[PDB]
Each structure stands twice: as C-alpha cells, then as structure tokens.
Amino acid sequence: ARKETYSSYIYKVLKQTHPDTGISQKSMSILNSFVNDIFERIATEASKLAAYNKKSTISAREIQTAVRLILPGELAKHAVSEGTRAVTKYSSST
Amino acid sequence: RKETYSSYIYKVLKQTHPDTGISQKSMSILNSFVNDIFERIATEASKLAAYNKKSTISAREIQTAVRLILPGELAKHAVSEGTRAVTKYSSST
Amino acid sequence: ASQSRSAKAGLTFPVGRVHRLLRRGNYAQRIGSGAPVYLTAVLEYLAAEILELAGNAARDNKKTRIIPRHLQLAIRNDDELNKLLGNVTIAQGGVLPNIHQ
Amino acid sequence: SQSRSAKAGLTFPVGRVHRLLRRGNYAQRIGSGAPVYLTAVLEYLAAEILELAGNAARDNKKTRIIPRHLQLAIRNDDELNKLLGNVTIAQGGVLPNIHQ
Amino acid sequence: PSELALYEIRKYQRSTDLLISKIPFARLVKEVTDEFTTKDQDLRWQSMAIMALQEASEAYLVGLLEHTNLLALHAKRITIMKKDMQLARRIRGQF
Amino acid sequence: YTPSELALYEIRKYQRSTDLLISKIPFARLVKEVTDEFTTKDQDLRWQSMAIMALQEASEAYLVGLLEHTNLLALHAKRITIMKKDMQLARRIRGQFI
Amino acid sequence: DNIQGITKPAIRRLARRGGVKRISGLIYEEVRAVLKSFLESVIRDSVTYTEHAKRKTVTSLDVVYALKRQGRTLYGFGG
Amino acid sequence: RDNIQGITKPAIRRLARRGGVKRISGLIYEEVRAVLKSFLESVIRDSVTYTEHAKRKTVTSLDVVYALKRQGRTLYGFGG
Amino acid sequence: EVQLQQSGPELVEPGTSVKMPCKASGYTFTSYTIQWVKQTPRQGLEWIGYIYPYNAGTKYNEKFKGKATLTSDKSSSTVYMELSSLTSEDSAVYYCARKSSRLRSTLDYWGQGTSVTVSGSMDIKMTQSPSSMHASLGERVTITCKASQDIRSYLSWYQQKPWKSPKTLIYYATSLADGVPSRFSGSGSGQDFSLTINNLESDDTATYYCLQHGESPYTFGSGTKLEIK
Amino acid sequence: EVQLQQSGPELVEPGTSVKMPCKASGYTFTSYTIQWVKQTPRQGLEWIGYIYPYNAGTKYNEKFKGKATLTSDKSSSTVYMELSSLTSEDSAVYYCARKSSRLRSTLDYWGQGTSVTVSGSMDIKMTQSPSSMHASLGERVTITCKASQDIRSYLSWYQQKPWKSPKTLIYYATSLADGVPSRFSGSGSGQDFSLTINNLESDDTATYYCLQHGESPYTFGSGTKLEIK
DNA sequence: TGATATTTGATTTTATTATATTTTTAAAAAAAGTAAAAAATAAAAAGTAGTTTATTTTTAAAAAATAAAATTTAAAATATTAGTGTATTTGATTTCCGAAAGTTAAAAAAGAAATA
DNA sequence: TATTTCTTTTTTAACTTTCGGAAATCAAATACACTAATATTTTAAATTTTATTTTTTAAAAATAAACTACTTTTTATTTTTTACTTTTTTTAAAAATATAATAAAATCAAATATCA
C-alpha cells in the first residue's frame, strides 16, 4: 500500500444510497480531502481537550465533545447519535 | 505550582530599562504572549516534520517554522538571533 | 473466525486504519479503544450525508455521474454544511447562481 | 554544572522549553538544538515587545508598564500588528483615530 | 453639538474602562447560559470568567462599530444605520 | 440585445460554468515572475503543472469572492458601477491582505 | 428584561469609542441582537468545555479556550 | 509586454461577470491586478519556503495546498 | 423550547385569498425548513410543500402547485402561506411544522394550527394495517405501515390527539424523538415498518400516523386510532 | 530589488520652498520608515527626521523643527520633504534612506540624493578618533567611534565613496550587513566601538562613518578618510 | 455517434487481528477549604422622558462624465510533436545523534518581610 | 501595589553511558519540466459614437441631539449558608508491547459496457 486513500470505502457508501450513480475521479479526490480534513480537525480538538484536563488518553468522550464543538447545529446531534450507536454495538460483541 | 515566564521577563526587562516596572496584569499579558508564540512555532514545526516523513524536530524545522510564522524583518532578526545561540552553545558543548 | 472491527461495529469505513492514524498522528500518548469506533462512525455519517445530497443534485440534472459542481451545489445550498465548509475552495465548483437587484 | 541557557547566552530557560517540547505531543523525538533556537527566538520577541512598551511608557512620564502601553506598542508598528492581528489585549483600549 | 461629538470621541478612545455596566452583563450571561444548560444542571460563573467575557464582547462590538462607521462614510453619510451594520457583518463573514 | 440585457445574460452564462477564466500561459508566466523574486540568489525553482493549476484555481476563487463583496459595496452607495474606492474598502473590512 | 440592561447610553459610548459621530435610532436593537448572537456562540463553546471536565462552574480558562476556538484570542486571563 | 499585463481586461470582465457585476469602472483593472499580485506573493512565498525546506528544486502541488491552508484558504481537489 | 405561533381561525367566502403566518422563535430561523400540512376528514393529512428560509428555496406537492405560495421574511422571522382561488373543499386545518435540512431528521415541531372554512400515481401510498383497535391497559399494541415503494429508513411515527397538533414519536424508523417515553418502539426497514406501544396508559388514546420522506412528495399514513376500554 | 529613487538637482532663491520626491520600489511601503539625512562639508552628516508610512507618524531633529516637513502618499509609494524659508546654509545634498521599524535595524538602503544649492546639548557626541590614515595594499585597519553616553549596541558603520551615496557595512555593532565582504568586522559595546578592514583593497578608498540610533536624535560620526597606497 | 473516462476481477505486499502480560492510567470515596450566591442597606451616579431646535438625509432635475457597443486589424494562446538535461526517488552503509534509567545538584515558586 | 532579600524546599534540570534508530549519503535508473517550431484559430486591442449612469444643486422632510428634572439602578460593605473544587489511596480496569498468522486493499490491466 504505497498510497492510502478512502476511495475504496466511499464507493461502498455511495453504492448503498444510489446504486446506479457513479462518481468521477476529481469528485473522489475532493471527498478524500474532505474526510482527511474533518479527521484532522476532530482529532486536533480531541488532543487539545485531553491536554487541557491533564489527561494522557483520548477516550470516546473526548471524541464526542470534539464532535460537538466542530460540527454545527443538527450535524452534531445526528453524528453523536451515530457514534454512540457504533460504540454500543462494538462493546456488545466483546 | 504554576510555571510562568515572569521570573525571566523581569530580568530581560531590567537589561533594557533598569528602572521601569511591570504591573501584574501586563505581566499576565506578556506571559500569554510568550506561551501563544511558543505554541504557534511548535505546531508549525511539528507539521513540517510530519509533512516530510521525519520523526524528529531539529533546529532546521524550528528555523522554517519561524520563517513561516513571523512576518518580514521580524522573522529575519529572529533567525539571526536563534542561529547565534545554536552556534555558541554548540561550540561550548 | 476473525471479524474486522468495522464489521464488529457495523460500519463501512475502516476502524483499524483510523486507530492506526490516531496512534502515529501525535495527538495523545494513549488512544482508547472506543475513539476509533466513534471517529469512524462520525466520518462515515458525514461522507454519506454529503454523497447522498450530491447524488440528489446530480439526479435533478438527469445525470448519472457526480462531478465537483454537484458537491459544490450540495454544500452551498445547505446551511450547516456551509458553516462547516465556510473557508474551503472546491476545484471546478463554480459559484451559486446568485443575482440580486 | 553550567545551565543550558547560560551556556547559550540566553535569559529564558532552555531546559524548560525542552521539557515542554517533549511532553507536548509535537514529535516522537525532539532533537537537541531545537530548545536553544526556540528559546533564542522567544527571548528576542519578548525583548522587542518589552523595549517598545517601555519606550511608550517613558514618553508618557510613567514609571510602570500597563496594558495600554503594550497595546500601543503592538498596534503602532507593522509586523507586530500582523503577528497579533487576531489578539485582544485586556484593558488595552483602542488606537486613537478620527475620520474626516 | 457638532463639536461636542468630537470631544466625546476623543475622550472615550483615551480610556480603557469597560463601557457596559457590570451587573446587567452578568444577568445577560446568566440568562443566555440557560438556553444551553438549564435542565437539571444550573452552571455557576466565576467572576473572572464574566470579566473576560465582557472584555471580549466589548472589543468585538467596538470593532464592528468601527467597520459600520467606515461603511456609513462610503455612502457619504455621518449617521450609521442598520443596513451599514448588517452589510459589515455580511462582509466580515463570521458571527 | 440591449446593453442591460446582455450583461444579465453574461452573468447567467458565467455563473453556470465552472471552467477557469484566466488564460493558462500568461498566469504561468506571472507565477514564475513572482517566484523569481523569492529565489533569486543562485537557485531557480521549477513548477509542476498541477501546482500551477491549483494556484490558479485558488486565485480565481479569491478574486471572484472579492468582486462579489465589491459589488455589494457598490450597491450600498446606490450605484451599479464598481469603482476603485469600494474594492479597497472590501479589501480592508475583510482584513486579509492576500 | 436582561437584554434591555444593555442601555442606550452604553451603546452610544461604545460607538464613540468606535469613532461614530451620530447614531441612528434603529441601531440600538441591532447592536443588542449582534451582542446576543456573539454571546450565544461563545457561551455555547464555554459550557461545552466546562461540562467536559465534569464541573459545575465556568472558570476563566473555559472562556479563553472558547474564544480561541473562534479566532478571537484574548490576552490577560491565562492560557 | 509585462507579465501582469497578461491578465487581460476581458479576463477581468469575465471574472466580474461571474461575481454578479453589471458595470465596471475603468480604474478597476489595475486594482484587480494589484490584488492578484499581492495574493500570489503571499501564497508563493509560503509555498517556496515549504519547497526549500524539503531540499527540493521543484514546487509540487502539495506545497501549494499546504501554503493555502496556512493562509486560511483550504483547497479541495488537489491532494492533502 | 421552540414554538411556531400560528394565527387564529378565519372564515372566508369563495374567491378571497387567505394569508397565514408561521412565527418561529427559540431557534436559528435560517437553519430549518418550514413544512406545511393540510388535515381534512375526507382524506386525512397531506403535505403541501416547504420553504427554506436560508436561500428562500421552495418545493411543492404536485396537487397544490398553483394553489399555494410560500414566502418568508427573515427580518420578522415569519413564513406565510397564501391560498388563491379558494373552493369549499379548501376548508381544513393547516399546520406549519419545522424540519431540519438533515436528510434523516423529521417534522419535529408542529404549530398550533389554524382552521379555515370556505362558505398522483407514482406517489408512494402508505398503508396502515389496523384502522382501529381496542386494547386494555398494560398490553402490547402493534401498528404496521407498509410502503408502495422502497424507503430505506425514512419513516416517522406521529401521535395526534383529537383537535391538537401532532406529536413526534419516532424518526428514522427506530430513533426515539426527544422527550418521548421509552415505552414507544419502532422497527423495520425497506417496506415493512411497525410501531409498538408496550405499556398503555390513560392518555394513549389518539390517532397514529406513519410519514415517509424518502421521495419527493411526502405522504402520510391512512391513520390508526387507538381506543382503550 | 529595493531602490529609493530620488529626483535631480535643484537651484532656487532664498526665502522659498522646495519639495523632493523619494520614490520607493521593490518592497512593501508601510513596513519600513523613510529617513532623511543631509550632508555638507562643514557639518558632515546630520539626521533630519523620518516618517512611518504605515501610520504617517513622524519624528524631527530639534534643529530642523519647522524647516523640514514630511508627507507621504501611499498611492504612489513616495515620500515628500519640504524645506521652507531657504537660507544660505540650507545648501547641501539630501538623501532619503530606508530603515525598518525594528530597533536593531539600521538605514539599509540610501537614495541617490538631490543637491539643493541656494544663491540641543544632550545629544550623543560621536567621537571618531582617527581623522585619517594612509595604508598599503593588504594590511589591517582599526577605526574607533567612542560615544559620550551609553548606547547599548545600536551603532552601525558606513562607507561613503566620493560622489556616491553611502553603503551600510555593520549594524548592531557586530552584525555584518547583507552582501558585504567577510573581511569587514566590527566590535564593541557600551562606550567604545571599532571597525576593522582585514585585507585592504583598491576598492576600499572612502570615508567611514559611525552612526548611533540609541537616543532620540540620531547623531552621525565625524568622518574618517582612508587613502590606500 | 463517438471513445476518454469510469466500473471490474484477479495477484500480493502489507497491514490488521489475536493472545498473553505488565504497567498505568483513570474512576470511587472520604475529607476540608475555597468561593459563588443571595440578603440588607444607603450613597451616588447613571438612565429615562419630553419638547424644541438645529442638523442631516432624501428627492427631483439637469449638466457631465464615462463605459458599453461595433468593427477590424493584429497579436497570441492551444495543441502537437520533437530532444534534453535536470532532479526525483529508492536501496545499503557508515556515521551520529537521541532516548532511558539513576542521581546529584541547582533553582524557582510561596511566604510572611521589610522597607519602598 | 511592586520589589525587593531570605528562606525554603521540593522540584526540576544536568550529567553519564548503552543502545536502538533515524538521518545523512552516494549511486543509479527514470520520470519530467523546459525548451524550440508550427499553425489554425481563438482572442484581444483600438477608434468612435452613443447611450447609460453618476455627480451637483436646491428644497423639503425626517429625525437625531440637547437641555432639564426625576426616577431607577448600580456600586460598595458585610455575611451566612451551601455547594463545589482539590487532595490522597487504592484498586479495578484498560492500554502498551510483541509475534505469528490472517485477511484486506492497492495495482495492473481488461471487458464491456457505461456515462456526458
């Protein structure tokens, strides 16, 4: 894996909502950039949140509170609902 | 205990104006300034190292961070002041 | 058998790779096991939302392919998505058909 | 045991800056000579700000540096307004200006 | 009249005090905090936090009014009007 | 059509398109001129084609946004002619001197 | 009302510090709305910071961090 | 002639037509040229600093994105 | 803490147009669309259209195009719906309800409603299985809303008491609406969805609607009026 | 690169006003101040004052309070200097020179200079000890500039060739100027400063000045002519 | 209709997962001392209200400045092949710095302290 | 209110080696930005008229400010109860680390379809 991208997973996600619709190369590059940008935003805010409280661990709660700061309005609500549901499913398996 | 740059800012001031003083609030302001600029330069240096597949911060990363953060002649004088310190410390050590 | 962590949590985006990027990204000394799953869920949700809005935009032009114009239309026509991407340029996105007397 | 700051010819602490670089999650390893550079730059910036503020304080027949003097010193010159463009200085007031 | 306004402009630019009263601002901050957390958790406000928030708010308001005054002179007026403030906010781009 | 009509048609035409409005070759030459004044000691810097394309995309986006704000200021003073004096005011209310 | 606590003379004083020679009558309510919106944004971020730390009081550091999140850095209160 | 003159007046008229402009003063063109030069100077200075730090003699498309991100103008579609 | 104030009842003769407002308070007015819904006893609930205050963008139902016109005024924070060329059948109750721009969110807050009286093949039809059912206290009750076409998970359950505005129970077919007792549960995906009430109460007597917003016209259910003896 | 373009020579009668343009190109106008200096045979070099184009703030040497007036036009990147009520001694050469706002900075680049020809105890006294010296083609030289009161390190060294504008050699009393051969070296702090030319040359024949900018009026040196055999 | 651009199936380097183990953080539980809030109370400034003046914004019209159209040469950008010499990238080896305990000595933040 | 000397008095920072790791370093094969020529056309520049708009002046209108005199708050002083932050100890819980063996996701071309 010389070059790592999210393009393999964006195709899968798009093939659920719109099975017929395809996506161009430039659009896929844009979406890769978008996902990387939001990842670095939320991770940076979570790292600062852990630093402020004198904690050396980024837990799920740091990520939750970082999502609440970065995402505006009803994006934060649905994103928190989606993330909380995934952690519950992950822990129920284990 | 709260670490501050206050003890050093007092001694740096006494070299320029041996009689003027600093009030408590203006010293809080200067302490925040020093911490802010430290944060800016350190973050830019870390990004520079990460961009280049390097795992260490050296004096060259810090130099490039100073050149990117500080504007113009202010950046030009900080590079020469920082290079003089690295040179003198290296020769003594 | 071995179940991937993304399959364990019911996601399409990679939980393990997000865990790896957090470990080498110099964010914290320690990374909890719940952080990659949360972050992966949030990223998948955001990507799916923008992709489906862009697909709806593409349909209304009788189009099957998504081009950067559809992404630009999707984000600029939405308020929270515009706040999130307030200072972001999208190559070949154009401008919204905005004229006001 | 000579200190590192005195060895470099600085007043600001090199050891404390080295400790803040290692524990701050910036890079996996902080090569030496980086605290020396950052300490020299920090000392230069602090000295420049202090000297301009003291020059402003002397011109007002004042023997102490208050936040207003700092605000005046920063806003009165370029390359320090640019560096601190997004910064609000508490108890600093505004720059005297009137329009025609 | 035309002279007195210049005197007030000269006087209020020299000072560094807080122009808004303290108790009304504290009441307003405590009211606004409820819209974000008042269900079962009522938050408390440190005095220095209130002071910092007041300093930030007044700095923002003064800067916005400077840009509004710049806008009024563009239209060749001395009175700053509501459209001036709305246009300045729109062009600044941040709320 | 009439001069007022043609301007509206051009506005609608140039808002639909997404392509680059500045020519490629003159912009590349301008970029090389500008970069020559930063590396003039003994080093000459090359430029990847994608680098110049990204630079031109960003530059045109910034210019279009600035002209939109200039048009707003022109409408503020009850004019439809954007002049020099309201490009300078938009340039300064935004603050960013890029 | 608590928004009415921000009185007309205070807004005129703030405008004088901005260099305004004379103020229209509709400005005061618009300034009140602008101040309220600023406060909502900053206090929302500050309350999020406070509740993350499992605290019942908003400290001077929460306000500073909330301010810095929005590119409105403030010197003189910590950080 | 000069390289700034390569940004022709029709190009500026097109750029303003995209921005929603109906009429254009004659003094705009030189002002637009000055604004473009200032923007290019800032971004290219940052980009060249990024390139020279990496001991490279070519300016890659990633240096431009990083410089734009520094100036606070994120650009999607070219990497990063 | 959001309320969509609506005007009082007004009676008009045929031919004279009516304007009704949606005064919105307690939220950022531009971030949410305003949806308009008609309720009659002949057909039940129908979706007229919506206006998005942020860009003043509108979308209408096929039936009501030309009969309704949506406008907004950001300064007054008000959205008006105007009906023209009225007929005796225009007599109904018109609710104004807010829905976020999120694809998943539902018509989450309804107005008080205003009552006025005058003196489609490809649209998905949603079918409720029990038209009415009686159940004692503390018993499990299930309601089924089948779908003509596939909707992924965009289906919401509404409870409307007699002569009151509907209350949102579940959105996205599983998620519980905020402020709703956990007794209510939702299930299903695709074309088969279900509402389950676990412990019935005194006040659980109301009509229960399924609403789908998967496709361009939103279609309500037929209705299911729980009764308790 | 940076050039401070200056007008041509001007002749005028006494009792008259004259304006000199100093156009600036190759750098940002607002970042740097513009300094004005006059050179005569009787008085050597005198500093008149400066203007800061960023905020249009000026400072005047007390001897020239009123005789010289600076204005700046940001539109054309030029600074104007007005001499009023011209008198017999007002005849000299006038240079405009660029200085940064930073305290360690010196007058980096000078203008060509206009020849105008007509037809205060607390100053820092700058004592240049060797008034002249003859030297061969490669030995070493030392020039001393003593200062009356303490100036920390704000002292720079200048070389001015016959019929040319000066050139900066040293600044901050140790630092080497840009594009200056490494043989030149300066030293000292406090009261006594020195300049050294290690490998003398054919192109090293000029008058060497010491300039201090620690105090309110900037006081140049007295001069030193060096002839090389 | 045409044919550059997107969708696909198999190879294969490379991460991902799993399993024991040890360290280390972070989540209870009991004090104990701040520090915010809510009362009570007068001095003391600050804000509200009302009318009249005096300043400015707005409107309509006529003189003026100027920019958009219309052609019509003239300059230059596009596109396409050609060579070339530069600089980027990848692999193997010595050099060389930076980390990791353990420890000893400075040094810096708090506190009642004198004078300032 | 700052600014000291003194005194602590823990708390860091400096020193020393032992090694694991990363960075400097040639060398080579290659990818590729930069020239030159050509040419066919797309675009841009220049003159001149005209047609649209901006600027200036004069009257009319709207509306802010200035006193003047009263009320309504704020502000400063104590004060008590009450909740809330901070500190220690531990012990349960969770993440780091290593090692094989596995399972996935970039690469490279192919097969036909796909789109615009």
Numbering used by the authors:
A (entry chain D): 36 to 129
B (entry chain H): 37 to 129
C (entry chain C): 15 to 115
D (entry chain G): 16 to 115
E (entry chain A): 134 to 228
F (entry chain E): 132 to 229
G (entry chain B): 25 to 103
H (entry chain F): 24 to 103
The article reads:
In contrast, budding yeast chromosomes have point centromeres with single nucleosomes that are defined by conserved ~125 nucleotide segments, including three centromere determining elements (CDEs): CDEI (8 bp), CDEII (~80–90 bp, and AT-rich), and CDEIII (~25 bp). In budding yeast, the centromere CBF3 complex guides the deposition of CENP-A, an H3 variant, to form the centromeric nucleosome in a DNA sequence-dependent manner. CBF3 is a four-protein complex consisting of subunits Ndc10, Skp1, Ctf3, and two copies of Cep3. Here, we determine the structures of the centromeric nucleosome containing the native CEN3 DNA and the CBF3core bound to the canonical nucleosome containing an engineered CEN3 DNA.
We reconstituted the CENP-ACse4 nucleosome using a 136 bp DNA that includes the native CEN3 sequence. The dissociation is likely caused by the surface tension at the water–air interface, and the weaker binding of the CEN3 DNA to the core histone as its AT-rich DNA is less bendable and unfavorable for wrapping the core histones. To overcome this problem, we used a single-chain antibody fragment (scFv) that was shown previously to bind to the core histone H2A–H2B in the nucleosome and prevented the nucleosome from dissociation during the blotting–freezing process. In the structure, we found that 115 bp DNA, including CDEII (83 bp), CDEIII (26 bp), and 6 bp of CDEIIIR (the region on the right side of CDEIII), interacted with the core histones and formed a well-defined left-handed ~1.3-turn super-helical structure. The end regions of the CEN3 DNA (2–14 and 131–137) showed much weaker density, indicating that they have flexible conformations. Amino acid sequence alignment of the human CENP-A and budding yeast CENP-ACse4 shows that the lack of several positively charged residues in the αN helix of CENP-ACse4 is the likely cause for the flexible DNA ends in the CEN3 CENP-ACse4 nucleosome. Also, the DNA position in our cryo-EM structure of the CEN3 nucleosome is different from those in the earlier two structural models. In the structure of the CEN3 CENP-ACse4 nucleosome, the CCG motif, located between the super-helical locations 3 and 4 of the DNA, is accessible for binding by the Gal4 domain, suggesting that the CBF3core could bind to the CEN3 nucleosome. In the structure, the CDEI is in the linker DNA region, allowing for binding by CBF1 in a specific sequence-dependent manner. Using the dyad location in our cryo-EM structure (position at 74), Mif2 would contact both sides of the nucleosome dyad.
